Structure formats: C-alpha cells, structure tokens
C-alpha cells in the first residue's frame, strides 16, 4: 500500500544503471540494479557470518567472533578457518555498503532532491575502509583489521588504543571526539527548539521563524538559521570521521610511541623547558 | 548542484526583529553587528544577547569555580606563568588522594576540589533556568529545558552522586584538560573494564546513532532547500512537497519514514538517552556491579579466545612464590 | 613531529585483538648500536695455583679464584664501571688491599648483590643474566636511577635545564610527566611501586558485584589507587619500550592465564626483584657514600626497570656473558 | 554477602538491562513509530477494497489527533483523512502493483513525478506580525543585497540549452529569515513573469546559470495569482516544476546516467 502522497512520485526513470529492468518496488521499498546487488551482498555475508560461527565455540551472540588472519599472512588469502571467512566477509560488506549508498543516489534523482543524503553516507563507509582496508595496507597486513563481534570488535578497539598507552592524547581523537560530543548536543537543542515551536503546550499558538531565531539570540547571543542548522549539523557529524580518520591513521603508520609523548613537540621546546 | 546548500550566493540585509517576550524585553544588551563571512554560511547578524538574573548568576557562580581551579592549577607550578602556560593542559585541581570516605577533605587534599564542584553545580543550575524561562518567555515548549536537565544530571552522576553512593569523595572526577581525562582510564580499570558496560554501550549507541541522525536530517533537509524544506515549522502545520519527497526518501530505502516533525522526536530522544543511558550505567557502577567484565562473564556474553602465546598462570599463585 | 613509515609490528595475541609491539626502525636500530658497545668477554684464562684467599689479603667474596682469573675479573669490572677512571676509580694505587677509597666497599657489596641477582632472581634474569655494565654502561653513576622524588633528565649523563632541577618546585609536573610517558598522572610510582613492599600494585576486584565489608566509605581503596598503577603501567611501558599489550589482553587487565602473556610473569617477578635490591642492596648504601651522591632526604641512588632494560624489552637485546663470567652466578650452594 | 544481589541468582544489575530494552522499545514503538504516521496514513490500496472494512491495524498504527492552533487564526488536525482528488496524467507500464507510472502528457506542466508539488494552503504564508513573508525588493524596501554580492538585476538567465530565457527583474526576500528565496524574471518572446527558486539557480557576475529546464520551457513556469505575493501552494507549484526538469528536460533525462 502507500502513503495517501506516494502515487503521483512513483514514476519510472532516474537510475544510474540497468534502466527499466529493475526500476520497481518491492512493497515499500525500490529496488533498482544496486537494491539487487545490496541483496546478493548482504545475502552471501549474512550466509558467511552464519557459517563462520557454527565453526566457532559458540552461538552466543555477545560472544561470537570471526577474526582476521594472524599478522605472518601479510595482504595474502588466508585459509578459511584461519582468516578466510573474515575476508570474504569484508568484501561482501563494503559490496552492500556501496550498493546501498548508489541505490540512494537512484531514488534521490526519481524525486528530484539533491544527492545530499548518499554523499553524506560515503563518510562512514569511508571510515570502515580506513579501519579494514587503508590502515591495515600500510602497516602490510589484513591481521590489523577488527573482528566481527559484538563485544569482541570492543576488545579490537580496547587493545588498539592501549597500543598507544594512552589514546585519549591522540590529536585526532580529540578532535573525533569534540565533533561526537557537539553533535549529540546540537541534534538535542535542534530537535527541542522546533517541537517546541510547534508544540508551545495548553492550546497556545504555534510560533515562528521569528521565535525560534529570538530564542538562541536571547540565550546565547546568536542564531545560525533555520536552513544553516542542516548545513551544521551535517558538519558536525561528518566530522566525526573526517578527522577521526587522521587519528586512526597516523597510529602505526606515521607513530609508534605513545600518544602522551607526542605532545613533546609543545612541552620540550628549549624556551621554556 | 544546489549551490545554495553549500553557501548562501546573495547576502539579504533588513531591519533586526525583535521578539517581545512576557518579560526581560529591558534586558536585552549590545547593538547587533553583521559579518558578511558569517553570512555565508549562517545569519550574518551577532547580538544582542539577554541578561537576566539567572544568566548573571551563572556567571557569577561559573567564574568563582574557574577562579578557584586556576589559582590551584597556578599553585601546582609554584605561581611561574611562563611554566603555567606551557604545562597548562597537565595542571589540575583533584579530589581527595586519601581516602576520607564523606568526610569534608581538607584543603590541601580535595578541598578546593568540592568547592569548585559546588560553585559549578550553581552556575549550571543558574544556566538551566536562563533555558528553561527564556522558552516560557517567548510562549515556548520546554523541550530544550529537559534535555538540558538530561546533561546536568550526568555531569551531577559522575562528579557527587555516584561519589555519595559508594561513600567516597575520592572518586570524582578531576578539573583539568588532561587530567580529567586520566580519571576515565582510573575508573574504567576501577570498574573491570567500561566497555563490559551495557550502559556505555547505550550511551554509545545512542552518541553515534545522534551522528547518523544529524547526517541524515541535516542532508535529508538540505536536499529538498530546492522545496523550501527548511521552513520546517510550516511544513509541520502545512505539508508541502519538501516532505512527501523527504519521508518517499525515507521510505523506499529503508522500508518506513518518520514526519518533518517526528524526526525532531528521534533527534531529541536519541539526544536524551545518551545522557540517560550514561548516568544509569554510573548509578550502578560500585554501588550493584564490581567488574563489569566479570558480570558478563557471570551471564555468559563474554567472548573468549586462544593463547597465541602460552598460556600464563598467575605467579602469585605459584607452590612457593613470594607476596 | 611524527615518524615516517614502515613501522615494524609483533603479533603477541590471537588474531583480529589488535595486541603486539609497534616500533620504529630507526630507533631500534639506534638502540642495538648503543648496546653493541657491551666490551666482549676477556680471553679466557687457565686456572692454575692456589686460591687467592690464600694469595691475597682482603678478598671475601671472590676468594676461590685463582689469581689470573681473579685478576680478569678485576678488568672487567674496571671495563664495566670505570673505564675512563681505571683500577685506581676503587683502589690505592700502593695498595690493593685498602678499603679507603668508598667505591671499594660499594664495589664488594655490588658483586654480592650481582650473584644474588644470578643465583636467586633466575625467574626474571634466567640464563642471560647480568653484570655490572647492565646498569653501569661504562660510568660509576649509572645512567638511570632514581630518587625518592623524580629527577629530569631520566638519563643523568644529559645536563639540566634549570626547571628541570630538582629545587625548581615550578618544574614538578612535568618531572612526574617524563617518567610516566608524558601522562598527567599525578603519582610517583616509584617511591609507590618499586622502593619497597608496601603497597599492592592489584586494583581491580575479583568479582562481578561488590562485596559487603570492603566496599562502601573508608573500607574503599581511594580511586587515586587505580590512577598509581596506571602511572606505574605507563612507566613500565615506556622503561621496556613497549606497550599494554607486551603483557595483557585490555580485554582484562586483571586476569592471567589465556589473558596474559608469558612476559607479564616475567614482570611480576621483576617487580618482586626490584624492590629486593631497593631494600635490602641499595638503600642501605646510604650510609657508605659521600653526601654528594645522595638525594635531598639522604637517599642512595636506587633502581628501577629502566636502570638495566634502557628502553629495550630484554637490557642489551638479551646480550650474555654468564657464561664468560661465572663468578658472577649463578653460584652453588652454600 | 554482595550488594546488589538478589534471589534465585539474579543481580540488580541484571534486570534494569530488561528494563532498559522495554523503556527503549516502548518508545520508539508505541510513542515514535506513531508520531511517525500522522502524515500520509492510512495507507492507500491499489484498486480500492477500501473501507468498506477498515483493518485493526489500520487503527492500532495511527496515534490519537493533535490539534495545532495557528499563529494567525484557525487550526490544523493531524492525522487527518486527505484525499488527492486531481487526476493524474500517469499511466500504468506493467500490471504488478511495484510497477513505475509514465506520464501520459508534458509531465512538467501535469505536475507528476519529480514535477508534483502538494496540496498546500492557498494562502500567503505570513510574518510574526502578520505582514507577507516572502515579498519581492520592490515591496520589501527596507530590505537589500549585502555589499560584496551580486545584484542580478538585469542580469540574463541561461537555460541548460545556453540559450537566454530571460532578465532578471527583481528578488523576493524571506521578511522573517532575511534571506532571498526566488528570482524574478521577464521570459523573453512570452509576454509574461516567472519566478524561479534560488536553488536551482548558479550566480555569476554576468548571467544567471539554470541547468534545471531548457529555454523554451519556461514559458510555462506556473503563474502567481498575484503580482507582489505568494501563497503557499504557489510557491510549491513552482520550485515544483523546475525540480520536474532535473528528470524530465529532455528525453535522455530519464534514463540511465552510465
Ligand atoms: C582504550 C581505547 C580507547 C579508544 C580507542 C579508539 C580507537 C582505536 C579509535 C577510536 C575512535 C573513536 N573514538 Mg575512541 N573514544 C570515544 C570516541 C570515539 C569516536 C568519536 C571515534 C570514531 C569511532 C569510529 O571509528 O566508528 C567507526 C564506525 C563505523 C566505521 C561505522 C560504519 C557503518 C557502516 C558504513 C554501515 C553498517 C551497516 C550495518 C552492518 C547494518 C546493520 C543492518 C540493520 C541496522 C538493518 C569517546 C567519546 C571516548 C571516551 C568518552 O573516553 C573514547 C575512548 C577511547 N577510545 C579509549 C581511550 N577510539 C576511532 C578514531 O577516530 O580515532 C581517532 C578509532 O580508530
Ligand atoms: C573504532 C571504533 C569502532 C567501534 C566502537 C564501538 C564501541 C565502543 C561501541 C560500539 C557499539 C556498537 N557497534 Mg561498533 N560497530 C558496528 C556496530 C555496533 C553495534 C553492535 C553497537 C551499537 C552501534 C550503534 O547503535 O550505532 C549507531 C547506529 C544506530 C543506532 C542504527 C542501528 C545500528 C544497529 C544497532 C547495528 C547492529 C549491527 C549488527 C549487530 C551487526 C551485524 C549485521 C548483520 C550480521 C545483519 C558496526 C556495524 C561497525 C562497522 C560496520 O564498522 C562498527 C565499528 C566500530 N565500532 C569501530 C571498530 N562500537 C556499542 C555496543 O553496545 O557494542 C556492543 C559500543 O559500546
Ligand atoms: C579506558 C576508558 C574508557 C572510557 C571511559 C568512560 C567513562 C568512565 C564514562 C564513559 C562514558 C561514555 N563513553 Mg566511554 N567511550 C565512548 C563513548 C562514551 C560516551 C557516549 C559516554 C557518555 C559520556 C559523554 O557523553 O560525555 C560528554 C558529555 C558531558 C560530560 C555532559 C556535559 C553537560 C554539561 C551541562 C556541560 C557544562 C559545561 C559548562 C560550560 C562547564 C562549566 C565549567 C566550570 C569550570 C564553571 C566511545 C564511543 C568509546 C570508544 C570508541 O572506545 C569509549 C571508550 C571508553 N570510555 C573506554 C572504555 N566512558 C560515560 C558513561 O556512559 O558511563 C556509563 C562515563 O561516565
Ligand atoms: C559521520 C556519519 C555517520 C553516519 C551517517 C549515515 N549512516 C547511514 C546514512 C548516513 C547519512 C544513511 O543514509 C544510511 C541509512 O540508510 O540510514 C538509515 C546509514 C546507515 N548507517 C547504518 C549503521 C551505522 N552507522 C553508523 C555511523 C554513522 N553513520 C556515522 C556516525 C554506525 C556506527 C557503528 O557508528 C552504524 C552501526 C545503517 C542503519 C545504515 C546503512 C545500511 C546499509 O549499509 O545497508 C546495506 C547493508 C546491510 C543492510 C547489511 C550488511 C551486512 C554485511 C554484508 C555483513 C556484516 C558485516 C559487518 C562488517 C559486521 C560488523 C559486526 C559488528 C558487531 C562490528
Ligand atoms: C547529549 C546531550 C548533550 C548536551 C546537551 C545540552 N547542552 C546544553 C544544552 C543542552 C540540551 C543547553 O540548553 C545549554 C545551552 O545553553 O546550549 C546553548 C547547554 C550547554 N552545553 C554546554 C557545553 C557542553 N555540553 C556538553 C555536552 C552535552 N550537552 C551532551 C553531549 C559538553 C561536553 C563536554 O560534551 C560541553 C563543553 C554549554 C555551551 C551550555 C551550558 C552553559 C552553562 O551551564 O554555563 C554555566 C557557566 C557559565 C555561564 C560561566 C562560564 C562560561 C563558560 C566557560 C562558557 C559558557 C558559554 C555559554 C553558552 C555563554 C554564551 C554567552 C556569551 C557569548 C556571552
Ligand atoms: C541470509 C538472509 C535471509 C539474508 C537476507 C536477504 C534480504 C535483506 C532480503 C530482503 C529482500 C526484500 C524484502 C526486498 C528487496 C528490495 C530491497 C532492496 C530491500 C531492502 C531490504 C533491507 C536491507 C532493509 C533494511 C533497511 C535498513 C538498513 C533499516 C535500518 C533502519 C535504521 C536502524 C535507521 C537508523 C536511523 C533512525 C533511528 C531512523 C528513524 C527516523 C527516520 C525514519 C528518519 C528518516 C527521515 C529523516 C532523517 C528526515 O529528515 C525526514 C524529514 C521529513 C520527513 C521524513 C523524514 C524521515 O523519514
Ligand atoms: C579485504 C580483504 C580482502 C583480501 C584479499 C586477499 C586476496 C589476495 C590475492 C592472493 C594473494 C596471495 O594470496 O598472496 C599474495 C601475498 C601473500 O603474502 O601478498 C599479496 O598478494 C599482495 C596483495 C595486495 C592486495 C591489495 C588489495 C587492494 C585493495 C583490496 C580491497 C579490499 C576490500
Ligand atoms: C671497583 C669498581 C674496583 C675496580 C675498578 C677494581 N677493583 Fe680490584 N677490587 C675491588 C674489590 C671490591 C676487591 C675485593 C674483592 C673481594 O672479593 O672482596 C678488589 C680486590 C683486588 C685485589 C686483591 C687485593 C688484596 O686483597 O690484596 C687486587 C690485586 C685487585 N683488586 C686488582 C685490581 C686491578 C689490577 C684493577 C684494574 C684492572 C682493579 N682491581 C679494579 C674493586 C675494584
Ligand atoms: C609487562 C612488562 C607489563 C606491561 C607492558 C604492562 N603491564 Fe600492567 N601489569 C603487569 C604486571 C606484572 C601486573 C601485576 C603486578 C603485581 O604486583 O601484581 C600488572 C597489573 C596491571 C593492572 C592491575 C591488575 C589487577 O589485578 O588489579 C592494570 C590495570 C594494569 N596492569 C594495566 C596496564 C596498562 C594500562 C598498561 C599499559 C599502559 C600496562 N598495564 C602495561 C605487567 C605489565
Ligand atoms: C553532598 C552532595 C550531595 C553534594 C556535594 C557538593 C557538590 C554538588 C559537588 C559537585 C561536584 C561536581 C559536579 C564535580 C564535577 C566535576 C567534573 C564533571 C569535572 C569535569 C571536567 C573539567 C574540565 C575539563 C575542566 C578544565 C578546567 C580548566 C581548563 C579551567 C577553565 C575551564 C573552562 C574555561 C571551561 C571549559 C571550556 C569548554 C566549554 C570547551
Ligand atoms: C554581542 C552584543 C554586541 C557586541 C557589540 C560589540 C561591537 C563590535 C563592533 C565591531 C564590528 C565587527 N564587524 C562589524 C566588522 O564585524
Ligand atoms: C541553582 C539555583 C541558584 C539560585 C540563583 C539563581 C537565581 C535566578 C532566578 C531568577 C528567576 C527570574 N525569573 C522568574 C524571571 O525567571
Ligand atoms: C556494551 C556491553 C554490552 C554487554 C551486554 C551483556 C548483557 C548480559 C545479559 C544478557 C546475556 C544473554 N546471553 C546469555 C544470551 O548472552
Ligand atoms: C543502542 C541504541 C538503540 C537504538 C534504537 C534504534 C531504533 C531504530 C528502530 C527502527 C524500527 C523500525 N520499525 C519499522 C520496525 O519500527
Ligand atoms: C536495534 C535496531 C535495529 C533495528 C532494525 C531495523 C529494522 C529494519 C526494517 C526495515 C523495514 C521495516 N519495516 C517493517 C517497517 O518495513
Ligand atoms: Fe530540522
């Protein structure tokens, strides 16, 4: 069925591949020559994480794990049970990623709206490929990749930082972390200030433009706009990543001694050490 | 492309409005100015700003506290400003050393720790009645107000509840930049790991998800500024073309959609519960849970792995090894 | 700023945990250089004649010797401690038996604590051992030792900054920050940790939920424990040269067995070593050296992880002469 | 004995974990996922087999109405029963209900696809104190373009074929954002206006860029009612249309990119 607005949208056209052949919905989602590749990739993954774990020491799903190989088999295939599972896994992953991001792209050009919504999807799938793909090429092997497990990706992570003694001085973290932070409370002070435009509560008047903009003047001396907040807030969250990216990167590759000591290039100039 | 969305290509100027409120409208301080760079990318006017009594006694209250951790910071390098600003990111105003259980520390060992923690609770508490009658003001919901009071009430759990439950002041959280951030690496190895958590892990899952949300709507409404999207309160009482297209979006891709205004509803709770999620997983450390990693051992979520080198008993534990 | 690529990494847990050694190249290559300066071992010697505790008048540690061996020995520790000074850095020129110069008596009680360190610490030293040049490396002050407050530079052969000075009270965070890899943890572990056996490194509990009895007010440990061992982990870490995961799985810091290392034993039993001769060889050294050796609460100059490893996981790359010097121990008993 | 132990080896702990999903699944499924369907539902059946019988689910997925009371008189319910009465000049080009719909005419100008805008209120969407919000330089003088910007006035507008479609003759501001949303412009060889949203238009210093419609096309740019205002409806009919070229400008449009 569809929304009472939906018919008059649902027009044929707009795709980047395939034309007419898969350009339909399935209920209420399109499918698209990327919604059948999303399919095959998710299905193939989904059937290779199923048979990963039923060769592993248990079903429970906190603590099912499929790890990379060891670090000794470099950039090479490793042997299924050694590191082979989580391999094909990755690929099938970032195969459904993008075809999730092009199908988007798709159904963003039949409704005429800017692409904006995949573009800001390339961002995490980016930082995926810096964690799987890039980090691990320039440190020379697959090893250094994280594991598919819901707590064990956390031990990955645990350690990874611990590598570093302390990666809370990590430059880049810092900045990640500052951008995850201000997002959050961005996303609440966006979110509370239109309800409470539109929900003013005991049967009062929904307010304005005027009013949301007098609002953050008043209690903080500026208001960025109603079109400006979007733009920031998809900012904001990019950013997690975009500079996070740098810290991640820069651990192994471009340092190797713990994150603290980097501060050095401040602490020890001769002036005032 | 939509150029519009990245920038804005031509500048409006106009007469400021001002927006009576039921009281203050004498409180309003400053002339506002305009910056044309600003403008680019947001309103290009800045000012005026509301005083108010709450405002200034969050001022009054805030810099008393920051008053009192830089006199202690300065004291940490013996009142030396040149080593004062180079070792400032390590200087800090700690909580008791010594283990005093409630007892009112001395001065010398967490006293002017609590005290800085007082003088900022005041300034927050000060701030958040600022938020919360400035919406009254303006005949406004309270929704900022109580995602605010969300955060407080964190910042509250890890500075003097959690402290107050398990009966020690010495487990607060330090002023500094650096070493408020060591105290998460001591209460994380306190507590037997923070990411054996289930709480953290909410908190999590809610900050990042916060991310993909902000992404989404800031792109999904970005998208449709061609349609006016952007306009949200009258599409809220008025739905236009910017929203059928936005929730279709939505809806041929992940299979449901939201309204322009229930996304504000995601957006919020999400906001909320990393906050909610966080203070409940701290009134539960130490005061239920000793070893968050032994509880998920306990309840069988835990995932275990080889020895890749070989495996090592504790030597403490070994037939004649000293203490 | 940074260090260029490739970096050199270890496996040291099971696969996709992200555990193993991350090292410089070029800083490890510096290192070997500097611990390829370790002289070889003197060419041996034929044992023939008698005991010199029957040639000679003061010998009481080395007395089973023979005269050419005992006199090998005696190069070589001029070697290892006081190459530039020579024999007369500990001895009367005129005669060998005289105890006046105080390097002599130290000299006499440093070879009974280095056969006790051979002989009776084999579950950290094994069978690489130490000598003299471990900790010397070739000076009479040991490079790196520590105070019961901490002293900048870490290695004593590098000249003072002024506010790296001990009396320039405005230089004390960052004297801290230096021995604990640049952390702003505000501990000593040291004078805490590694002086002597007062306090338990351990402080994670051992159970899932808190125990009734030790768990509320001043039954608690005050959290500042937890920060003290972070502090003494960082330091530990930056003395080897290596990071958390040489010994543990962060999974949980607390737990051996599949979640430790073999090198993480090692380390206990180093722990354990350390503060034995703190205790009971260096401390007491206080009362036979000049004043102007000691620190400014009277103290003798003690040791630590760094004073023989020097960054490195095994000192001198796990470089040996136990063989060459048996006299040094392992000894037989009794 | 431990605190936060309980009887038959639970843990506090434990059960404020359950509790938690609840609280979380409540909201998002029985408040959220509500609040969710206040526009566009119910759902809409293909031939019809309408109601006639209204399912359960039909009432169990829509929360109870609000009511807003607007700022300048009146009031809106959602959800409400709206029903999209127009005709649309789509035709079917399968028979399986997933099947895409075709236009049937010039779909820019039947206002389907890309090219549909909503049933907006036919009134002019107002200031805070009641004054036209979205009003052209002309009315709104007060207002004016930030030193340093382009002033398009007089400036030839550039279709996606490079030919000239037209001058710009003015720009409507936004009174209550101070923000510019529409040019103005004369079509050339029709005897008539059209305004054209700024999002569709790229700003130089010597033309106006609209990659969106070809020139010929915007002799049928829909009209305003009236000269210096616009309502609600108006200004969706428009952004509306030139969105229905970015498909629809040529033949090729429709079709796959690569
Ligand atoms: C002990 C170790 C620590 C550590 C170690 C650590 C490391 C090693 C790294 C981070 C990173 C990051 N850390 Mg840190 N960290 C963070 C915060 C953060 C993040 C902001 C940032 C980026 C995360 C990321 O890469 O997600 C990645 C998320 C991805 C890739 C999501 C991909 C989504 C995908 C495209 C789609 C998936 C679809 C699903 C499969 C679909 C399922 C189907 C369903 C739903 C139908 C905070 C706020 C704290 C606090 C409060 O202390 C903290 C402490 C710590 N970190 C410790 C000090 N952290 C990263 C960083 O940027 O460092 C600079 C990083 O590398
Ligand atoms: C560099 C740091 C990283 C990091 C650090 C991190 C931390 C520290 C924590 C999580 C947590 C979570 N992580 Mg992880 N993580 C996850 C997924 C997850 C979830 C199991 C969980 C909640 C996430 C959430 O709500 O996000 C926002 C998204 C929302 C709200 C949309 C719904 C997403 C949905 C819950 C995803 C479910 C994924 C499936 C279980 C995966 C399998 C899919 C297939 C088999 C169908 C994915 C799919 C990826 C990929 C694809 O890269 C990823 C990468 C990373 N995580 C990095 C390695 N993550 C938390 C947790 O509780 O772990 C147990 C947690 O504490
Ligand atoms: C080694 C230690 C680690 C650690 C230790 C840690 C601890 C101890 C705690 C968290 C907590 C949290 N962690 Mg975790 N963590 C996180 C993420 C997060 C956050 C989502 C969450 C909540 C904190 C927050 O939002 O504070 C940012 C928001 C704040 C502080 C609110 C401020 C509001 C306030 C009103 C602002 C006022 C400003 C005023 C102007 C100030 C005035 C100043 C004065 C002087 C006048 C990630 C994503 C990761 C990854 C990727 O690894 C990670 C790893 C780690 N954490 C490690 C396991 N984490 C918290 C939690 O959930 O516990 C269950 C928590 O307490
Ligand atoms: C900085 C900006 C950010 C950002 C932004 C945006 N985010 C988006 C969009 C935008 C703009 C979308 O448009 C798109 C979407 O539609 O939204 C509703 C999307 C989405 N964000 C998802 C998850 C998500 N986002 C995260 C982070 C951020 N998002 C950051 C913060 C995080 C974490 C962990 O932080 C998670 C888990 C899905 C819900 C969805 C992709 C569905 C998919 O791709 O479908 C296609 C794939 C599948 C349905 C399943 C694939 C299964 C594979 C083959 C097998 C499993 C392999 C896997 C590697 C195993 C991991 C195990 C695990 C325990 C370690
Ligand atoms: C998940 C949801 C979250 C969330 C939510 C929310 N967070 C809010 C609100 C909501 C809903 C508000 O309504 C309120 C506000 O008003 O927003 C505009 C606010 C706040 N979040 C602040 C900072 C913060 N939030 C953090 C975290 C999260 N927040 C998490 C992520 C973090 C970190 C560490 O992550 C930080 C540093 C301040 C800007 C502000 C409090 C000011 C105060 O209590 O001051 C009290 C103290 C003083 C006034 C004196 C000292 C002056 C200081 C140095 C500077 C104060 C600046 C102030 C704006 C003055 C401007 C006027 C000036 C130009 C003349
Ligand atoms: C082995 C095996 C069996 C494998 C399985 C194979 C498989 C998947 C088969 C399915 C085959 C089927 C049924 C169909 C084929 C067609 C096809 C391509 C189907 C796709 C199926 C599929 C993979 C579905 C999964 C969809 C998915 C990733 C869902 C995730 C949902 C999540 C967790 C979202 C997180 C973000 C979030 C909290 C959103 C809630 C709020 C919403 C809805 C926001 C969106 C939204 C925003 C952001 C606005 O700004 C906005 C503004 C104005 C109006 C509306 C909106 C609006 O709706
Ligand atoms: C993601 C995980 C995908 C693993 C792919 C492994 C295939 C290696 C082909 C056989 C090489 C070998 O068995 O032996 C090769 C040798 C083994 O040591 O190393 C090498 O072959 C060097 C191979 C270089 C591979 C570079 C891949 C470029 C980007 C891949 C995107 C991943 C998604
Ligand atoms: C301090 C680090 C020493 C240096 C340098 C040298 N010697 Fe030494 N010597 C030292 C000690 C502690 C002892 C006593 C050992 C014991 O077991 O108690 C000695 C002893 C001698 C003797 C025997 C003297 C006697 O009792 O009659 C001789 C002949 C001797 N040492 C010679 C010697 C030479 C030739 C050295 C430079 C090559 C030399 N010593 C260095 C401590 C130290
Ligand atoms: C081997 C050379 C180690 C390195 C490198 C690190 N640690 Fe360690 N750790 C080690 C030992 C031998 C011990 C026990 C000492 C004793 O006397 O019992 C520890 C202990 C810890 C603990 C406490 C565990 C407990 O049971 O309570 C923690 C929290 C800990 N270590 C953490 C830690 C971190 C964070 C490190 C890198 C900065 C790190 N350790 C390094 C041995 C070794
Ligand atoms: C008995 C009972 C029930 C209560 C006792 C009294 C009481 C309420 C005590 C409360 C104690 C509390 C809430 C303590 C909280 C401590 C916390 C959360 C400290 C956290 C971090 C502090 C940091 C990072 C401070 C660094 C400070 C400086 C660098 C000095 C100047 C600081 C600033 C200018 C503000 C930071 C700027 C930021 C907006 C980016
Ligand atoms: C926030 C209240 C207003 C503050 C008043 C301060 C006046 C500054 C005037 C300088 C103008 C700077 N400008 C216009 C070039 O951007
Ligand atoms: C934490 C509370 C500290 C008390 C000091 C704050 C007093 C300000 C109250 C002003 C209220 C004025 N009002 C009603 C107009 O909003
Ligand atoms: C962020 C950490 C999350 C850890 C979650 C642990 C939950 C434990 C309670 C449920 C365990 C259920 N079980 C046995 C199926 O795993
Ligand atoms: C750990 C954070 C929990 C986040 C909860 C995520 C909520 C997204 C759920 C969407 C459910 C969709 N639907 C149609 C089944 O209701
Ligand atoms: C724990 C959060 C994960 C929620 C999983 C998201 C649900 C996927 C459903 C896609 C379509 C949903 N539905 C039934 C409304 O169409
Ligand atoms: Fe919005």
Redesign the pocket.
Known sequence: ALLSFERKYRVRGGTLIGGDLFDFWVGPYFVGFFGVSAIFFIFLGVSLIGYAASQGPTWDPFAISINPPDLKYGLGAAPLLEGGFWQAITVCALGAFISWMLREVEISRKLGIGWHVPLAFCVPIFMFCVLQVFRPLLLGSWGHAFPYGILSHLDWVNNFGYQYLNWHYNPGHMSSV?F??????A???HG?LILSVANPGDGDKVKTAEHENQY?RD????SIGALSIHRLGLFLASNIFLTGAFGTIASGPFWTRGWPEWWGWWLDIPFWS | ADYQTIYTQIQARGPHITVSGEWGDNDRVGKPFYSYWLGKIGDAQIGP?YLGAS?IA??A???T??LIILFNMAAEVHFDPLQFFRQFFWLGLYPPKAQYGMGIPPLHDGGWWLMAGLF?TL??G???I??YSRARALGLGTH?????????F?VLCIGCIHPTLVGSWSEGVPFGIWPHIDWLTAFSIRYGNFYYCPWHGFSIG??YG?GLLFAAHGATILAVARFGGDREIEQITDRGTAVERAALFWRWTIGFNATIESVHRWGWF??????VSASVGILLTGTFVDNWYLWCVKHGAAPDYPAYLPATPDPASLPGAPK | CFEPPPATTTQTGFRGLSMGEVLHPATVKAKKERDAQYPPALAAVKAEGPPVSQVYKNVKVLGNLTEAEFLRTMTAITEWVSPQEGCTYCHDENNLASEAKYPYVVARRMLEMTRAINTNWTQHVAQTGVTCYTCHRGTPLPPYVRYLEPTLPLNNRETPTHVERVETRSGYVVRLAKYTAYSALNYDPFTMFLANDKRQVRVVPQTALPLVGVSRGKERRPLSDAYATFALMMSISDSLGTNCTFCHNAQTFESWGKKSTPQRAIAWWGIRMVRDLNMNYLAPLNASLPASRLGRQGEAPQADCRTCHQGVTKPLFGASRLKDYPELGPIKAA | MYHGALAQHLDIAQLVWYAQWLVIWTVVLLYLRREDRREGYPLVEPLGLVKLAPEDGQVYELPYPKTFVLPHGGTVTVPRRRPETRELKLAQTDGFEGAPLQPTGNPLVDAVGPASYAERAEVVDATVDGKAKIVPLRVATDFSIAEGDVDPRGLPVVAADGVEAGTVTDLWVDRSEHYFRYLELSVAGSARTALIPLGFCDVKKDKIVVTSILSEQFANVPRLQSRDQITLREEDKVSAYYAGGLLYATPERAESLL
């Open positions: 500052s995850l932070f201000v997002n959050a409370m996303l609440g002070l509370g953050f209690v903080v001396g500026y | 700003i405002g969050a001022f209250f805030g810099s506290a920051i900022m300034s927050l000060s701030w958040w600022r938020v900022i107000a109580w995602n605010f009071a969300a955060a407080i964190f809610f900050a916060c999400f906001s909320l519960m990393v906050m």
